[PDB]
DNA sequence: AAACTATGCATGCTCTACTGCTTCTGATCTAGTCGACT
């Protein structure tokens, strides 16, 4: 029961761009550590009748961090490629 | 004089080739991404 199969994307999206538009880092750090707080109450809520469960929050550190990504290899689609492809997918 | 038969013709139908026009498809040239090398 993997805890990012109940976080929408869209709060992490939200707490991303509450982030980059604070100008002082003790906001970012807030925002970042009342995400944290928020994921590990809803994780230790919810694993308690637990076996030592092996799930953490890299569903969420691999997307906040992908320069350190290493399992995936490369996309293949950069941003030429991705600009293309918005544009036949949309049908602009 | 009337009934049956004969030829004769026309037109629509079917097939096979023939030619020319239009559209689809297969072969041939380059941008980007990843990787190799010095």
């Not at 750090?29 to 919810?46: P, T």
């Amino acid at each position: 029961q993997t805890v990012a199969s109940h976080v929408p994307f869209a709060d992490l999206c939200s707490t991303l761009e509450r982030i980059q538009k604070s100008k002082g880092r003790a906001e970012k750090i807030r925002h970042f550590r009342e995400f944290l707080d928020s994921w590990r109450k809803f994780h230790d809520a919810l694993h308690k009748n637990h076996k030592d469960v092996t799930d953490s929050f890299y569903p969420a550190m691999r997307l906040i961090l992908p320069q350190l990504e290493r399992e995936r290899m490369a996309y293949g689609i950069k941003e030429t490629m991705l600009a293309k492809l918005y544009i036949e997918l949309l049908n602009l």
